[PDB]
Amino acid sequence: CFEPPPATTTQTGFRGLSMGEVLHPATVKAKKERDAQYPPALAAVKAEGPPVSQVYKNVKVLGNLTEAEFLRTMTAITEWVSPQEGCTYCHDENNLASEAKYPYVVARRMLEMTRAINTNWTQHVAQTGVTCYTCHRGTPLPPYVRYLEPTLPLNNRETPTHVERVETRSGYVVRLAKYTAYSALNYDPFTMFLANDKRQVRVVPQTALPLVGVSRGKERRPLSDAYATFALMMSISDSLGTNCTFCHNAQTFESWGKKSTPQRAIAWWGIRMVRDLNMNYLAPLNASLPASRLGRQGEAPQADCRTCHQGVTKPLFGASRLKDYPELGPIK
Amino acid sequence: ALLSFERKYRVRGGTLIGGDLFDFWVGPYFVGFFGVSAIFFIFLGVSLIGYAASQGPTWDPFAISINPPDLKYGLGAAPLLEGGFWQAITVCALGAFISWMLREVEISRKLGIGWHVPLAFCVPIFMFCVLQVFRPLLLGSWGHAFPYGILSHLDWVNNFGYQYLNWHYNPGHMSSVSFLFVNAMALGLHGGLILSVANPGDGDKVKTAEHENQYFRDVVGYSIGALSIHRLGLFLASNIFLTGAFGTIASGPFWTRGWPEWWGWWLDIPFWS
Amino acid sequence: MYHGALAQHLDIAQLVWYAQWLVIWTVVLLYLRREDRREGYPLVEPLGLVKLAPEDGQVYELPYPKTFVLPHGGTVTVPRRRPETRELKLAQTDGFEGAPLQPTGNPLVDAVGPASYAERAEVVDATVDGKAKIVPLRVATDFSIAEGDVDPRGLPVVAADGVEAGTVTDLWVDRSEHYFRYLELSVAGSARTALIPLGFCDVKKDKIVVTSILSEQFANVPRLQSRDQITLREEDKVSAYYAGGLLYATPERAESLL
Amino acid sequence: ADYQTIYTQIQARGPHITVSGEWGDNDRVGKPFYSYWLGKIGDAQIGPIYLGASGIAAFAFGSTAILIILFNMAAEVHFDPLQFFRQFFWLGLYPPKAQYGMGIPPLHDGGWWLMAGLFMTLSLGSWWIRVYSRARALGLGTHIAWNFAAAIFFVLCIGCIHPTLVGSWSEGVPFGIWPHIDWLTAFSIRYGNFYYCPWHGFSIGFAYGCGLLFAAHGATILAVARFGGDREIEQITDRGTAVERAALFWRWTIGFNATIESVHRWGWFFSLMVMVSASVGILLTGTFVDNWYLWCVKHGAAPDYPAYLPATPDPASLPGAPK
Numbered sequence A: 001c002f003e004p005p006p007a008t009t010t011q012t013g014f015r016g017l018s019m020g021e022v023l024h025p026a027t028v029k030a031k032k033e034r035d036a037q038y039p040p041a042l043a044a045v046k047a048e049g050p051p052v053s054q055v056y057k058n059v060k061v062l063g064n065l066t067e068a069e070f071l072r073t074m075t076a077i078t079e080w081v082s083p084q085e086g087c088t089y090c091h092d093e094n095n096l097a098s099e100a101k102y103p104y105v106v107a108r109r110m111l112e113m114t115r116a117i118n119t120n121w122t123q124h125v126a127q128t129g130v131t132c133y134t135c136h137r138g139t140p141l142p143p144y145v146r147y148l149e150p151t152l153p154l155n156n157r158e159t160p161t162h163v164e165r166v167e168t169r170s171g172y173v174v175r176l177a178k179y180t181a182y183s184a185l186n187y188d189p190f191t192m193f194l195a196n197d198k199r200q201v202r203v204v205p206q207t208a209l210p211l212v213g214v215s216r217g218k219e220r221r222p223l224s225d226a227y228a229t230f231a232l233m234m235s236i237s238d239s240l241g242t243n244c245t246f247c248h249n250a251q252t253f254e255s256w257g258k259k260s261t262p263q264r265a266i267a268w269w270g271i272r273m274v275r276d277l278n279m280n281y282l283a284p285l286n287a288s289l290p291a292s293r294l295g296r297q298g299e300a301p302q303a304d305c306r307t308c309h310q311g312v313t314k315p316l317f318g319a320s321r322l323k324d325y326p327e328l329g330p331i332k
Numbered sequence B: 001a002l003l004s005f006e007r008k009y010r011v012r013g014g015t016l017i018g019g020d021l022f023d024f025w026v027g028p029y030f031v032g033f034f035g036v037s038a039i040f041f042i043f044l045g046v047s048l049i050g051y052a053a054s055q056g057p058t059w060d061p062f063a064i065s066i067n068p069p070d071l072k073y074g075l076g077a078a079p080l081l082e083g084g085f086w087q088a089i090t091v092c093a094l095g096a097f098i099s100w101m102l103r104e105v106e107i108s109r110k111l112g113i114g115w116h117v118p119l120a121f122c123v124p125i126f127m128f129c130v131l132q133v134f135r136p137l138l139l140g141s142w143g144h145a146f147p148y149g150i151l152s153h154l155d156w157v158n159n160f161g162y163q164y165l166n167w168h169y170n171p172g173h174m175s176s177v178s179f180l181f182v183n184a185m186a187l188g189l190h191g192g193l194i195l196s197v198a199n200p201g202d203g204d205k206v207k208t209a210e211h212e213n214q215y216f217r218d219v220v221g222y223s224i225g226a227l228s229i230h231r232l233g234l235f236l237a238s239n240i241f242l243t244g245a246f247g248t249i250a251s252g253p254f255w256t257r258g259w260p261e262w263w264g265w266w267l268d269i270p271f272w273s
Numbered sequence C: 001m002y003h004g005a006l007a008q009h010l011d012i013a014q015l016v017w018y019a020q021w022l023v024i025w026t027v028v029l030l031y032l033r034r035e036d037r038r039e040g041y042p043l044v045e046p047l048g049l050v051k052l053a054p055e056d057g058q059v060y061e062l063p064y065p066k067t068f069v070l071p072h073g074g075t076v077t078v079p080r081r082r083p084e085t086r087e088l089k090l091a092q093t094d095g096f097e098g099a100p101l102q103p104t105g106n107p108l109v110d111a112v113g114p115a116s117y118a119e120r121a122e123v124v125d126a127t128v129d130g131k132a133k134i135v136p137l138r139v140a141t142d143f144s145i146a147e148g149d150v151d152p153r154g155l156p157v158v159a160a161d162g163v164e165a166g167t168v169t170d171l172w173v174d175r176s177e178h179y180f181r182y183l184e185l186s187v188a189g190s191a192r193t194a195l196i197p198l199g200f201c202d203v204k205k206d207k208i209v210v211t212s213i214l215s216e217q218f219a220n221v222p223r224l225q226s227r228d229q230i231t232l233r234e235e236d237k238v239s240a241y242y243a244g245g246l247l248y249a250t251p252e253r254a255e256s257l258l
Numbered sequence D: 001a002d003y004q005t006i007y008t009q010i011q012a013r014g015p016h017i018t019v020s021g022e023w024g025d026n027d028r029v030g031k032p033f034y035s036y037w038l039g040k041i042g043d044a045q046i047g048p049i050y051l052g053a054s055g056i057a058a059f060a061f062g063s064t065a066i067l068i069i070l071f072n073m074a075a076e077v078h079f080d081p082l083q084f085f086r087q088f089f090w091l092g093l094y095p096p097k098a099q100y101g102m103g104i105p106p107l108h109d110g111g112w113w114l115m116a117g118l119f120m121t122l123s124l125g126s127w128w129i130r131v132y133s134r135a136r137a138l139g140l141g142t143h144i145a146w147n148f149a150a151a152i153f154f155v156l157c158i159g160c161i162h163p164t165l166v167g168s169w170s171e172g173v174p175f176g177i178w179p180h181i182d183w184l185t186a187f188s189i190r191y192g193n194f195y196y197c198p199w200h201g202f203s204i205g206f207a208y209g210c211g212l213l214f215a216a217h218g219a220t221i222l223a224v225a226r227f228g229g230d231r232e233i234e235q236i237t238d239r240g241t242a243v244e245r246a247a248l249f250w251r252w253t254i255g256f257n258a259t260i261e262s263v264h265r266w267g268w269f270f271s272l273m274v275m276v277s278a279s280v281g282i283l284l285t286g287t288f289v290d291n292w293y294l295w296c297v298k299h300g301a302a303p304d305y306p307a308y309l310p311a312t313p314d315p316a317s318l319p320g321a322p323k
Ligand code: BCB
Pocket: B097, B124, B125, B127, B128, B157, B158, B159, B160, B161, B162, B166, B167, B168, B170, B172, B173, B176, B177, B180, B240, B241, B243, B244, B245, B246, B247, B248, D184
C-alpha cells in the first residue's frame, strides 16, 4: 500500500509553489544498480594500417576506421546488443561479409540511426549521447518498445498473463491504464503522438476570449484532444520517473518563459526526435524483420521515451560513452 | 448596546485564566485573556504582512504573496525577505487561532452551554497545522508549506496535486471531497426543511416536528430526526478535514508515486491479473 | 473578432463579476442581516429616553413584521415589543458600560446568568393532534423503554458531592419525536418530585450520576404547576436551574480553572 | 459532558405516527421496523416509504440509464464477469471522441452516452416533482425543491447546456467512477486552469462556507441541547433560553448574530450558491472565456513569480525549429 519515509525532494520553481521531484531512495537506488550494469569502455586502440574500406569487403558505414578500431566497435556492439548470443547473432561463422542473417542488415541501419541521434539530435541528447546499450541493455530485443496497440508487460522480458496478452480483449483497459500511469484515460498516446507527426499536442487556447471562427461547432477541436494530451503527459511522466512540475508550473501549462523549466524544452525536442526515429528508422524495418517480431498489424516494434529513459530523467543517470566511441557520433 | 434579552446573561465568571482582570465586554465583544492574546497576535500578524508586502513588487491584493523559504533552509530560520516573514506570520496565525478557540471556551462556560463549538473549531486549526507544520516536519523543510496570498496559495495547491500526477485518485482526497459534497447537500436539506415547516406560505399554519419526519420518511424512507441532523452535520463537516488530513500527510512522506498507481493494490492482485 | 468582447476593453465575464458581487451583498446586507434582527431588537442603551421619536438607524435595520399562524390557534408576530419585566437580582460590579453583573442573592433560585430562563408561553407544548407532547410514562402507557437499555425506574441519583439525592420514579417522553427528555425523581427527605433533563444525566446500570448540582440543591428545583404535564416556560426554568449549577453549584466553579 | 449529544442513552419506543397528506396516504408502502443501533445516533424507525407516480417514473427512467451504462461498461471488458469487477472503476460510457458538433453521434461513439443522459435527466425531473409535491401535500413550503432545482440545473450545465452553447457533445461528462473524474482535469486544462475562474472561487467559497456553517450550527445546537435547542420550530415561534444563549455565544464571539430561523436561511442560501455560482462559471466557460488564466492576466489579477531555474523560451518559435 505505502512507501516508508524519508522521501528525497528537489525544488524546480520559486519557493512556495510546490514544484519539484519527490523520490523514494530505495527506488532510485534499484534503478541506479540496474543502470550501473552499463559495461565500461573498452581500452583505446591505436589507429594503425589502412581504412577497413580497403581491408574488408562489405563495410558501408564504418569504412573510415582502422582494423583494430573497427574490431573494437564490433566487440562493443556484441557486449551491448547480443552478449549471450555472441558474434554469430549477426554473422555467418564462415563468411563475415555475408548479410544472410537479418540482424546484420538491421544492425547496419541501427548504426546509421545511432549516428543520426548523436549528430542531428544534440538538442535532446547533448554531449551525453546514446549507444546501442541505451535501448538494448544487453538483449537483441530492447526491453521497452511499443506496437501500434498497447501491450503488457511494459518490460517484454517478463512473461505475460492470459489477460495481459494482446489477443485477450477483456484486458485492453488494463493494458491502456498501465501505459498512462494507471489512469482511466481512454487514449493511447503512443499511436496518437509518438508514431508520427500528424497530431498537435497543444490544446489550450493562447487568448483569453474565444476567437470567432474557431470556437463553435465543428470548427472546434473535440474535448478528447485534451484528454489525450493529458494521457501523453501521464505516460511521459511515468517514463522518466517524474511528475508534471519537473517541466511545468501548473499555474499555466501552456506558458513558456518563467512558467517552464529547461527540461520542458529538452522534452519538446525529445518528442521530435522520437517521431523522426519511428517514421524514418524503426517503422520501415518491418520489411527486414521476421513475422515473430512484428505486431498484429505488421508493424515493427518502435520507440517511446521509456525505451531510452526506463523510468529515469536522464537515461542511465547521465552515463556517457561518446568520447570512448567517436564512430557513433557526432559525425562531421 | 444590549439585545433585549441579554442583560440577565452578562454575569461575572467562566474564565480559564485571569479571573476578573479581563472579564468584561467592549461593545458586543467579550474580551477575556484570550481576547487580549488574540488581538496581540492579530496586530502583530497584520503588521508583518504589511511590512513584508511593502518590500515586494506590488500592492494589488490578488497578486501579493508572502512565501516560505527555499527547501535548502530545511527546518531552520530563514532571512526575513526570503522566508522569515512567512515563518513569523505562521506563528502569529497559530497564536491567533488558538486564542480564538480558547476565548470561545470561556464564552461557553459563562453561558452554561456545551463546549462543542470550540471543539469543532479545533478541526480547521488541526488541518492548518497538517499543511504548514506536520507535513513540512515530515519532509524536512518549511519550504513545502503554502504561501500567503489570495491567488498564490491556489498555485501551490495546484502544483502540489500535480506532483502526484492526478490527485483526484488520492483515497483520502476522495473521502474528503465526498464529505464536502454531502455536507453542503445536507445543510441545504436541513435549512430547507426548517424553513418549509415555519414558512408554509399563503397564511397557512406553522407545521410540526411530526411533519418534519413525515416529509423525509415519505421522500427517502427514513428521517434521522431533529437533534441527530445536528450531530450528523458536525460529523459530516468535521470529516472533510479529519479524513482529508490522511491523504495530505500520506503524499510525500508515505507515497512518492502518482496516486492512480496506488490502486495497483486492487488492480494487480494475481488472482485476476 | 472575439466572442464575449464589448467596446473599450470590456467583456461579458468582467460585467458578470461585478453583478455577482452586487447580488451577494444585496442578499447578505439587505435581506439576511435584517432577518437576523427579528429577535432582541431594538437594542437597549443606558436609558433610551427619547420617547417622542425613534432613532433612524433602529427603523432602517429592521425587516417588515411577519406573522406566524400557530398550529393550535393564536398568532405570533416578529419582531415585536418584548422588554424583560421581572426584577433581576444582579448588581453592576463597576461603572464601565461592559462590566459584568454580580448575583446579589442565590443565583440558582433567582434565575440569573447561566441559571436564566426565557419568558416563554405558560403553555403546554403539543403534538400534531393536540395532546400534551412531554409526558411521564405513567401517562404515556403505550410508550416503553427499548429492549436493551437501562430502565432507570428504581435507581438512585448521585449528585456532585457523591451523596444519594433521590430515586428515579419516571421518565418523561416526547411523543412527537419518540425521545426521552427528562427523568422524574423523588428528592429524598423533602416529600417532593423533581425533573432533570437527560442531558444532565450520566445513566449507569446501578445509578444516575449528576455533576451539575449538589445533593442539597435538588430541594429548590423549580416545581411544576401540574404533576403530569409541563409548560414551555417550566421546561426553561427546570433546564436552566441545572445549567446554573455548572458555574454556581460551588464558589470555585465561577473562579478560573487556572 | 452531555452524553445525549454523543448518543441516545435510553431509547423510547411507541406507536408509529402518520401525518396525513392532502393526497397519496394509501401509496405509503412497507411496514415500519426498528433498529436499536441506528436508534443510538438517530431515530430508530425505518420506513414506510411513499411510492407515488413521480417516484416510480424516477426509478423507471433511472434504472434505464443505469442499465445503458452497465451494458456499455460490460462490453468494454468483452463481457468477462471477473475483469468487470476488477476494472469497474476504470470503465465508462463516453461522449463522442470525434467532432460531430451538435450532430447526433453514432451509437459506437457517443449515442449511448446521449441516451443515458436523456434518461438520467428525466429521472432527475421526476424526482424533483416528488420532492416538491410531497411538500405541498404535507402543507410545507417548497424550499428544498428550489435548492434541489439549482443542483439539477448545475448537472444540466455540465451535461448538455455547455455542450449546446459551444456546439459540441464531445464536452460532456462521461459516466464512470474514474472517467467522470478524468473529465475534470481535461476540462480545466482545455479552459486555462479552473483555479482562475472567479465562479470556481465563489462556488468553493460557499462550499467551504457550508462546512463552516454546518459545523458551527450543528455544534451550537448540541451545546444547547440541554435547553431543548433541537426543537427548532417552537424556538422560532417562541424564543427559549436555548436560542438566546446560542445567539449570545455568537454575538460575544464575532460581534453579531443570527436568529434560530435566520441561520437556516444563511445555510440554505450558502448551499444554493455553491450550485448557482458553479452554473454561472460553466455557462461563461467556452461561450465567453477560452482561457481563464489569460483572462485574469488581461485584467491584471494573476500573480507572477521569479524564475528559479532559467526562463525557457518556447522552442517552436525559434528560427529553423521543426513543426
Ligand atoms: C490539481 C490539484 C487538485 C487538488 C489539490 C488538493 C491538495 C493538495 C489538498 C487538497 C485538499 C482538498 N480538496 Mg482538492 N479538491 C476538492 C476538495 C478539496 C477539499 C475537500 C480538501 C480539503 C481542503 C483544505 O485542506 O482546506 C484547508 C482549510 C483550512 C486549513 C482552513 C483554516 C481556517 C483557519 C483555522 C482560520 C483562518 C481565519 C482567517 C485568516 C480569519 C480572517 C477572517 C476575517 C473575515 C475576519 C474538490 C471538491 C475538487 C474537485 C471538484 O475537483 C478538488 C480538486 C483538486 N484538489 C485538484 C485535483 N486538494 C486537501 C486535502 O484534504 O487532501 C486530501 C489538500 O491538502
